[PDB]
Design a protein around this ligand. Structure first.
Ligand SMILES: [Mg+2]
Length: 219
């Protein structure tokens, strides 16, 4: 059987993106720039905080000093951090808490393989820290998804080869990173986005230990 599950965070454990979105939206609103909506957040998701601020300024063709840029960056941070103080166990996606308990009940290693630089804080807020054997630090990998580095690092952080692991992901580039690591990917979403050659569940309630074991045995 698989010895570890490498968990992406955003779109698997919880909706982490909503908070960054709401922070940029509030900042834009505050300084009188229109256009940052859910669709436009596409442009901001997975993107540097500073590239993100610049794209927002370009919606209104505004230029600013370095000090005003710094001020606006800080404001978005303040916004973001205030909002994530309200994250709780109620923000855990369905199935995930029971999955984590079952994986620990079954002695399988659990690691985080998230691009979130606030993963530890977010797991603490969700009361999940205790389930995790390791958190792969996205600041310590040279390449983001779709490069495999973060899944390799997560597997290694629990003393396993990626070939002994399942990866769970909601993103196409994440699925690619899992594949290229050696680990076995199981997606949440749809094949149109994730690919036609992996097992995909429609939502996280389907991620059960029973289901992962069956997928492992069938692959
Ligand atoms: Mg994700």
């Amino acid at each position: 059987m698989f010895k570890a599950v490498l968990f992406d965070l955003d779109g698997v454990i919880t909706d982490a993106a909503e908070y960054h979105f709401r922070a940029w939206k509030a900042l834009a609103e505050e300084i009188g720039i229109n256009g940052v909506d859910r669709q436009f957040n596409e442009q901001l998701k997975g993107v540097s905080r500073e590239d993100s601020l610049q794209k927002i300024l370009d919606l209104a063709d505004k230029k600013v000093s370095a000090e005003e840029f710094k001020e606006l960056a800080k404001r978005k941070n303040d916004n973001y951090v205030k909002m994530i103080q309200d994250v709780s166990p109620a923000d855990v996606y369905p199935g995930i808490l029971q999955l984590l308990k079952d994986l620990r009940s079954n002695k399988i290693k659990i690691a985080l393989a998230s691009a979130s630089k606030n993963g530890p804080f977010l797991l603490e807020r969700m009361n999940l820290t205790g389930y995790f054997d390791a958190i792969a630090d996205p600041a310590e990998v040279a390449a983001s998804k779709p490069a495999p580095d973060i899944f390799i690092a997560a597997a290694h952080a629990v003393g396993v080869a990626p070939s002994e692991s399942i990866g769970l992901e909601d993103s196409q580039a994440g699925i690619q990173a899992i594949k290229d690591s050696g680990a076995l990917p199981i997606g949440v979403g749809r094949p149109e986005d994730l690919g036609d050659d992996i097992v995909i569940v429609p939502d996280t309630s389907h991620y059960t230990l029973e289901f992962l074991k069956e997928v492992w045995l069938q692959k």
